[PDB]
Design a protein around this ligand. Structure first.
Ligand code: ATP
Ligand code: MG
Ligand code: MG
Lengths: 985, 75, 147
């Protein structure tokens, strides 16, 4: 019942069972400030059964510092009543309600309870009931640059998946009678001792196919031991082993019990003495609020700080904590007590939403139990922060001014950022910038570029779009939405529709890039990341990279002249398969899926293109005869798709589909078996079809079978779409037409003047002339995974399953086929929120212009296990050039537009280096091994003229610089690396 | 001494070796008897894969030990 | 990338391979047109084969793409010229020069590997009727690899 057209990306992270159990749980959220609304948004996007809000406090202006669903026309109204209407629109399957008053017994109606902005007495009263009644209780708080999370899921929490990784699977070479199991060649099982596994498709030991779990004894990286298998058999040949995961019982402690004896989680191992401080500090904050009518300490107040420190001392004495309090850190928490930032709110909201999903679905390992986080390193130091500058000014930025001050507010309001891409991370970044007031001054500006369009599956994690917006451009909708969120950004946002690449340099030129302040990437492909990184390096602009994958996420910051570039942080490459394995000898479902995709392309895409080009290019045949690798293939395809096998109705499409079935699943396998019989042996006497090669078996077309019928339907539908006919789905027509079918006789063949040319000419003169068919064009089939009615994924699934049946491989359903064929990247809304929070926390460091490299942090996290880590950026490598210190990345040579000979003389004299190679992009301008005549012809030419002549392309009018890569040798002959040259045209 | 090497197809080859013999010598014997290049021989004993450059004694191989032979084939 | 390619090209220039001659196409450093001469003691004797080499961006951390252009009747080479060799797929390391790849391809021409073929019919003919395979190879290398 799960709408796979909307939760397509989320299911690959959670699963069908997880979401099915999640859609039957009720969540109550107490408190509806920035953190509360963020949690509610993430939960609603997640897909819980319902959400209930409870916050009777009337709205105030400062509450807009982080609440993005509030407007200045709502001042004086309870936040819940004005937020429910806007929240109910995020997802149509998640009702949202509001309760006027909250009685304790009412709490029995819910499955999870989230508590924010609530005093300690109320937290204790709620927890004393939600603990013994087995209701999940999550309490979150965000004070300035500090945050706290507490989780309590009862005393008998059952966790099914403990790490979020798929079960370990592997292919078995053979199993002895002693229980020794070995994988295939150079294959690591990766198992540990004590695990449970099950065996399937094991030959010689059918008993092991039942699936009963067995102990695992790891004897090495490639072998392990399972015990004694004497009774079931003596030796097992081939088969597949799959790991079995056992549930874990976790017993939590109530809040009242865990106040005295807390259990901490350390988000960073470089500072592990702080969380004991924060545990005292937050309780002191609650006590101080209770002692002054709920009024937090004033910002940067010394009297309130002293009273707060006295309260901290009192609490430490009362709770018998043998910890030496840190006066500086406690007073810092006191100063920022009334702070409310949007980056911290977004980060903690993402974390708490993930915790709610863990509590509801009984999946992943939750926090146990306290999680105290701080980003105090983000506090600016180049501006004046004091009690006078941090006082509220009666504006919507008070929640931020109370932490950063008015001078830093002015610095923020004059930023000119550039966001590349408008995906989920782009939407979150735009929300954060709108809330922070980025580029709201006279000199501020924002530019966002993205060339994609909104799809239905994107609405699950991109909250700035709506179902009515499907089909429109992302950048325009995002700009309009964020202008609605913050009216001050009206006319301060520019949205482009251009793909960032080499061809867009005419728009994102030097004039555009010299006015920016920072660039933030929200891309999803490595090529664009590398290109943007190179451009930023050339222009020396700070860069913010961020990536997500399911529940994992990472954020990196690049600072000019200080840290290394994104290039060197390149990830390991991807996986591709040899042509030999795909063509003839597959052994996994991925191989069959790739083969099915190639078959689809070669059946419904390439012949159509050839026919269309023949009917468009006047001289196509002659060029293809002497250019195409297989002109005979092209001519035969044209003939078949024009005259020989042109369908006239749907019955002929069914006949053609049956013929293709026989041609691809029955005749090729017979030919392959004829070439390599099942009893054949290698040159060494070893059997051929052994190990990584599986003996295929021809398929006989059984109409009653489901897979055959699916393949026939899919092929007929695609052929009709290619010829623009009308397809049908009733089985009656298929059964009727395929009943009277006579398979043409087929036998394997051993093989054994200008006849070939005369054959080609005979094919050619049979083709109808191009003039006879004018305006007749065939529609190619462009692959589209997201559409469920285009018969693409159905065809791929059918072909993959049939080929798996050929080679005795386990077939896969449509879910796995769609995941593999489309290269879908799993994604989550919580990961997006967390990465956006981290990036925006680094942005305030970038604005302040911190110089030391120890003040920046690259972040990594994995929410499936509650892991967070932060490490300093890597410094840019240095080098010695002519006895001088040179940065390898952030240095360049600036030279005028001089002749090549003058450039060589300058490098020989000024730098004392001999130029041996000079290139501009992918063109070799000059080399020391070229013949003297060519050099003498090229030496007296200017650089621009030389480039134009070599590249056979005139320089564009907007071009203003040339980046030259030069390899030069020293006087002794030792190669020395030098930075690139920036020729100024 | 004598040892037995079992292949993936259930065959048992008997070899006359010494505890001090190197793995290279055993792979050479297996190539001489079955014609499998040493580079493609993966010999396993007691859950540990024998590596070139060492001796049988290094792996605690004693009288009438049993090894398993598999073949690593490229694409 | 570019620096590594230039180093390899300069090394090739200094030492003439005699049996091989590789060079960039036009002035593009990421597209070479290599030449291989058929071995004397092989069915492809007296033949010139032209190969297209495309270097990846992360070269030499990634193997180059090598495709035949002259039609050849070989078990491990299909009609499209795709080559079935290990050093180009997994054994690739940031230490092998293009000269090593050309020498390896010449050796592959010297003796095919029918045990793990790419064109099953050619391998079957090779294993069953060697003389017919030799005749076919001579006919093809005379029709396509000459002129
Ligand atoms: N070279 C590029 N220049 C500009 N924008 C780009 C470039 N490459 C990708 N993008 C944008 O990056 C965003 C990718 O985000 P995301 O992957 O979440 O969305 P999607 O690709 O539409 O979805 P899915 O990955 O689920 O199919 C898209 O807006 C795409 O337009
Ligand atoms: Mg898209
Ligand atoms: Mg994408």
């Amino acid at each position: 019942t799960i709408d796979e057209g909307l939760y397509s990306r989320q299911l690959y992270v959670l699963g069908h069972e997880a979401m099915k159990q999640m859609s039957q749980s009720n969540v109550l959220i107490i408190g509806c400030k920035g953190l509360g609304v963020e949690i509610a948004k993430n939960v609603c996007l997640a897909g819980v059964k319902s959400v209930t809000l409870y916050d009777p406090q009337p709205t105030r202006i400062e509450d807009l510092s982080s609440q993005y669903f509030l407007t200045e026309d709502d001042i004086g109204v309870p936040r819940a009543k004005v937020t429910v209407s806007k929240l109910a629109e995020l997802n149509q399957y998640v009702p949202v309600s509001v309760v006027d008053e909250l009685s304790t017994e009412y709490l029995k109606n819910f499955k999870c309870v989230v508590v924010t902005e609530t005093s300690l007495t109320k937290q204790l009263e709620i927890n004393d009931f939600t603990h013994k009644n087995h209701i999940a209780y999550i309490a979150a708080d965000s004070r300035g640059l500090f945050g706290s999370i507490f989780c309590d899921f009862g005393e008998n929490f059952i966790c099914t998946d403990t790490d979020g990784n798929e079960p370990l699977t592997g292919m078995i070479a053979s199993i002895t009678d002693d229980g020794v199991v070995t994988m295939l060649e150079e294959t690591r099982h990766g198992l540990e001792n004590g695990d449970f596994v099950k065996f399937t498709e094991v030959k010689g030991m059918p008993g092991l196919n039942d699936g009963t779990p067995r102990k695992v004894e790891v004897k090495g990286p490639y072998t392990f031991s399972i015990g004694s298998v004497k009774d079931l058999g003596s030796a097992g040949y081939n088969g597949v082993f799959t790991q079995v995961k056992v549930p874990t019982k976790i017993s939590f402690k109530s809040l009242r019990e865990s106040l005295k004896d807390p259990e901490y989680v350390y988000p960073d191992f470089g500072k592990m003495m702080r969380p004991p401080q924060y545990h005292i500090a937050f309780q002191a904050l609650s006590a101080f609020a209770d002692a002054h009518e709920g009024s937090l300490p004033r910002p940067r107040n010394d009297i309130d700080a002293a009273e707060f420190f006295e309260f901290c001392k009192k609490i430490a004495s009362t709770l018998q904590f043998d910890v030496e309090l840190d006066e500086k850190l406690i007073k810092e928490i006191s100063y920022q007590a009334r702070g409310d930032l949007v980056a911290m709110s977004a980060f903690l909201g993402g974390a708490v939403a993930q915790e709610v999903l863990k509590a509801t679905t009984s999946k992943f390992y939750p926090l146990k139990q306290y999680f105290y986080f701080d980003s105090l390193e983000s506090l600016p130091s180049s501006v004046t922060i004091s009690e006078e500058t941090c006082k509220p000014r009666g504006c919507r930025y008070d929640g931020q001014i109370a932490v950063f001050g008015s001078e830093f507010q002015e610095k923020i309001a004059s930023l000119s950022t550039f966001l590349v891409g408008a995906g989920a991370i782009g939407c979150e970044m735009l929300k954060n910038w709108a809330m922070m007031g980025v580029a709201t001054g006279e000199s501020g500006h924002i530019s966002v570029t993205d060339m994609d369009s909104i799809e239905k599956s994107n609405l699950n994690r991109q909250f700035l779009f709506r179902p009515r917006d499907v089909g429109k451009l992302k950048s325009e909708c995002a700009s309009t939405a964020v202008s609605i969120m913050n009216p001050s950004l009206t006319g301060k946002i520019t949205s482009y529709q251009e793909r960032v690449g080499p061809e867009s340099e005419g728009i994102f030129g030097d004039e555009f890039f010299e006015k920016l302040s920072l660039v933030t990437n929200a891309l999803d492909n490595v090529e664009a990341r590398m290109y943007v990184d190179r451009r930023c390096v050339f222009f020396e602009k700070p860069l913010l990279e961020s990536g997500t994958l399911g529940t994992k996420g990472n954020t990196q910051v690049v600072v000019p002249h200080l840290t290394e570039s994104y290039g060197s942080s390149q990830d390991p490459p991807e996986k591709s398969f040899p042509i030999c394995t795909l063509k003839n000898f597959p052994n996994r479902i991925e191989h069959t899926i790739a083969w099915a995709r190639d078959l689809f392309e070669g059946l419904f895409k390439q012949p159509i293109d050839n026919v269309n080009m023949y009917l468009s290019s006047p001289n196509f045949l002659e060029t293809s005869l002497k250019t195409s690798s297989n002109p005979r293939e092209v001519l035969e395809n044209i003939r078949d798709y024009l005259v020989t096998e042109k369908p006239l109705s749907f019955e002929e499409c069914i006949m053609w589909a049956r013929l293709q079935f026989d041609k691809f699943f029955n005749n090729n396998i017979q030919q392959l078996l004829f070439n390599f019989p099942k009893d054949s042996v290698t040159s060494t006497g070893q059997p051929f079809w052994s190990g990584p090669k599986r003996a295929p078996t021809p398929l006989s077309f059984d109409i009653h079978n489901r897979e055959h019928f699916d393949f026939i339907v899919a092929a007929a539908s695609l052929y009709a779409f290619n010829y623009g006919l009308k397809s049908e789905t009733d089985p009656a027509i298929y059964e009727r037409v395929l009943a009277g079918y006579n398979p043409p006789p087929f036998a394997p063949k051993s093989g054994i003047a200008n006849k070939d040319k005369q054959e080609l000419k005979s094919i050619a003169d049979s083709l109808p002339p191009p003039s006879s068919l004018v305006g007749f064009r065939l529609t190619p089939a462009e692959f589209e995974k997201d559409d469920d009615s285009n018969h693409h994924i159905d065809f791929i699934t059918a072909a993959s399953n049939l080929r798996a049946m050929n080679y005795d491989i386990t077939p896969a359903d449509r879910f796995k086929t769609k995941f593999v064929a489309g290269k879908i990247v799993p994604a989550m809304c919580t990961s997006t929120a967390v990465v956006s929070g981290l990036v925006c926390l680094e942005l305030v460091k970038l604005v302040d212009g911190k110089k030391k490299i120890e003040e920046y942090k690259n972040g990594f996290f994995n929410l499936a296990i509650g892991l967070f880590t932060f490490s300093d950026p890597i410094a840019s490598p240095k080098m010695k050039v002519n006895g001088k210190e040179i940065d390898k990345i952030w240095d360049r040579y600036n030279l005028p537009d001089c002749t090549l000979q003058e450039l060589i003389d300058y490098f020989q004299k000024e730098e004392g280096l001999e130029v041996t190679m000079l290139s501009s992009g992918v063109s070799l301008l000059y080399a020391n091994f070229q013949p003297p005549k060519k050099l003498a012809e090229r030496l007296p030419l200017k650089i621009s003229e030389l480039v134009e002549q070599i590249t056979k392309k005139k320089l564009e009018p907007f071009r203003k610089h040339l980046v030259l890569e030069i390899c030069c040798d020293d006087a002794n002959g030792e190669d020395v690396e030098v930075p690139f040259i920036c020729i100024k045209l | 001494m004598q040892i037995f090497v079992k292949t993936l197809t259930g065959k048992t080859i008997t070899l006359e070796v010494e505890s001090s013999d190197t793995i290279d010598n055993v792979k050479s014997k297996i190539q001489d008897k079955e014609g499998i290049p040493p580079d493609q021989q993966r010999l396993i004993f007691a859950g540990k894969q024998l590596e070139d450059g060492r001796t049988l004694s290094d792996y605690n191989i004693q009288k009438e030990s049993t090894l398993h032979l598999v073949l690593r084939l490229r694409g | 990338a570019l620096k590594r390619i230039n180093r390899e090209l300069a090394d090739l220039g200094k030492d003439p391979p005699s049996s091989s001659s590789a060079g960039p196409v036009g002035d593009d450093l990421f597209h070479w047109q290599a030449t291989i001469m058929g071995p004397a003691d092989s069915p492809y004797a007296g033949g010139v084969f032209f190969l297209s080499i495309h270097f990846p961006t992360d070269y030499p951390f990634k193997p180059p793409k090598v495709n035949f252009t002259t039609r050849i009747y070989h078990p491990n080479i299909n009609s499209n010229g795709s080559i079935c060799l290990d050093i180009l797929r997994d054994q690739w390391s940031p230490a092998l020069t293009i000269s090593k790849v050309l020498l390896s391809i010449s050796s592959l021409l010297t003796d095919p590997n029918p045990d793990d073929p790419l064109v099953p019919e050619i391998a079957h003919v090779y294993k069953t009727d060697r003389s017919r395979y030799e005749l076919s190879a001579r006919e093809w290398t005379r029709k396509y690899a000459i002129g």
